[PDB]
Structure 1
Amino acid sequence: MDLVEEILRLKEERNAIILAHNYQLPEVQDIADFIGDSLELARRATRVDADVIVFAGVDFMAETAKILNPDKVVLIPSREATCAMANMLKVEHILEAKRKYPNAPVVLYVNSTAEAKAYADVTVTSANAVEVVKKLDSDVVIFGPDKNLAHYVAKMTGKKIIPVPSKGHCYVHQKFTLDDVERAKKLHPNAKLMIHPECIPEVQEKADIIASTGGMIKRACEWDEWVVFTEREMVYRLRKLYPQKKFYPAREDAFCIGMKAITLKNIYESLKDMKYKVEVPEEIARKARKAIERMLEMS
């Protein structure tokens, strides 16, 4: 079976769009209608004319698309496409922090459950966390789940950051070390380093640019050679966008298992079977939607 041909036909039959994250397998990126980071996928979720969304990404991302498109069918091809860091944050963490700091806005990374977003004042992604936190009317904000992004936000805004939970992090980005920075500079001495803010702070400090994957794409025009400190499928994405540049993985083994639960075959099966339908309870969705819409307004 020609999976690509079958998917193209089913997209037409289902009036479906495929939205893909930047960490998707190359063959999935190649059949997606739109590819982007967390923030771009959320905005693109607000101008969907199609009836069905196939979300080639992890669960919290498909949930966000469903919150913004409650009357469209949102399909996740595997329920094992999940984010380890997003599931570190529970409602009880948020409520405990709200108790200690009732006047602190609750700022939740989009890497969170819809249930957790129901208790947020505003959501953020890596691309807009600093701008959003800067503009909130408070010198202290509750922020999670990623402590490494928390550190970056604190450094850039000067505000006091109350992490929820205590040790939230992404195992993929925590793989990068100072030895990887030293190896990169030795193998590719003419390259600059683009580093995701989910990397540990001492690695962040070695960056030529700190950026979300979306900002990596935006700023890649500033140099012709880059070592890429994020999930390794980002190198494919950058190479396709800028064939005239050179991109090298900082670590080939920087692999997100949840992202790679999505396959060409189960995208085909997703459209064929109309599964797995993503649903968000109306009251959770209403409250999460308020925080997300406020994020999109605050840029």
Structure 2
Amino acid sequence: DLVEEILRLKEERNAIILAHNYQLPEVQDIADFIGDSLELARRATRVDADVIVFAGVDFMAETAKILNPDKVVLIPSREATCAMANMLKVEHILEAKRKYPNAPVVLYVNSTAEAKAYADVTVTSANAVEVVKKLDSDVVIFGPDKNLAHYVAKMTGKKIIPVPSKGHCYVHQKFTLDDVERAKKLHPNAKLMIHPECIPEVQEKADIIASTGGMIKRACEWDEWVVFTEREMVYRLRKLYPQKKFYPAREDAFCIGMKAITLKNIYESLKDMKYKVEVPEEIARKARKAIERMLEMS
């Protein structure tokens, strides 16, 4: 079926499939590498294949292209996009820089390429605290996610200016204190791993506040977990740790953009060499500096 044809074309194209943790299980199962956004960025700096098929969202594929100008990067659907990244506009960044001209600008690694050109360093949920703590300023411009910004402020003690003020990931915003209560009711011996893009009051109920990479690293600390992040992470964790139990905090917590990627459009991506991801060089050069700096700092 599609799996057999995909694998043949991957060989014919000298291609590698990189997948995010939130991809469908059947897509994770054909990927050469699976990770969070930080791990995907790092993995993109050691690509020896000629073609990268990105089972993720468009701005992640753009980050891979920024790091690999001489490789073909394919996004299987141009509708695979990130609602959180779309909330941040250049006008938000310019506005904040005029109010705080000496503050570093710290932006999520899969913001738009134009936004990343204004970043001094990029971050993800996995390294935001580590990076911001190392910056020598007590005020930081940070976005797009106001909930991650709040967590960073709490963990560093710095003043974190969120750009844009309402930016957030709708998937993580959904989680409520009622979901915490239901999780404790259903799995009283489970510990709660809660992503730092959840709202602060949900974060305060966590047994561990952790990025998805942190969820993998700290999963060894217990045998039973309820997972407050996008539901496909539960499949990823179950695959890594077949001896443990993982339960989604919400069955309906899914990223529509991530699920634009299908086995069928991965097959079509390799067959027809589409859709080719390109980033203008002036933007790419500035974004590359911020991404490479992030990788040096983490």
Q: TM-score range by the shorter chain?
A: over 0.9
Deviation string, structure 1 residues 171-199 (Cα, Å, up to 9, x no partner): 11111000000000010001000011110
The whole-number CA distance in structure 2 between the counterparts of 1:26 and 1:252 is: 15
Question: Per-residue CA shift, 1:127-172, capped at 9, x if unaligned?
Answer: 0000100000111110000000000000000000111001001111
Shift of 1:109: 1.2
Conservation of the 8 A alpha-carbon contact between 1:232 and 1:255: yes
Kept after mapping to 2: 8 A contact 1:85/1:111: no
Is 1:39–1:127's contact at 8 Å kept on the other side of the alignment? yes
Q: How far 1:16 moved relative to its partner?
A: 0.1
Distance in 1 between residues matched to 2:266 and 2:55, nearest whole Å: 8
8 A contact 2:63–2:110 mirrored in 1: no
Give the Å deviation of 1:110. 1.6
Kept in 2: contact 1:174–1:199 (CA 8 A): yes
> Shift of the alpha carbon at 1:111?
3.4
Provide TM-score, normalisation by structure 1.
Answer: 0.99
Point out 4+ residue stretches in structure 1 off by more than 3 angstroms: none
Contact 1:16–1:51 under 8 Å retained in 2: yes
- Structure 2 SS opposite 1:108: strand
Contact kept in structure 2, 1:104 and 1:141, CA below 8 Å: yes
CA distance in 2, matches of 1:58, 1:210: 24
Q: Is the 8 A contact 2:193 2:207 kept in 1?
A: yes
Q: Deviations for 1:38-63, whole angstroms, at most 9, x for unmatched residues?
A: 00000000000000000000011101
List per-residue Cα deviations over 1:243-277 (Å, max 9, x = no partner). 00000000000010000000000000000010000
TM-score (normalised: structure 2): 0.99
User: What aligned pairs does 1:1-299 form with structure 2 within 5 A after superposition?
Assistant: 2-299=1-298
Identity %: 100
CA distance in 2, matches of 1:90, 1:72: 28
Q: Take 1:109 and 1:9, find their aligned partners in 2: how far apart are those partners?
A: 35
Whether the 8 Å contact between 1:111 and 1:145 is mirrored in structure 2 is no
Q: How many residues align?
A: 298
Answer whether contact 1:172 1:256 (CA < 8 A) is retained: yes
Measure, in 2, the Cα distance between the counterparts of 1:276 and 1:159. Answer: 41
Q: CA deviation at 1:88?
A: 0.4
Query: How big is the shift at 1:86?
Result: 0.2
Contact 1:154 1:160 in 2 (8 A): yes
Question: Which deviates more from structure 2 when the two are superposed, residues 82-91 or residues 207-216?
Answer: 207-216
Is the Cα–Cα contact under 8 Å of residues 77 and 261 in structure 2 kept in the other structure?
Answer: yes
Following the alignment from structure 2 to structure 1, what is the Cα–Cα distance between the partners of residues 244 and 60?
30
Deviation at 1:295, TM superposition (A): 0.4
Shift of 1:210: 1.1
Deviation per residue, 1:103-132 (Å, 9 max, x gap): 000000123101100001000010000010
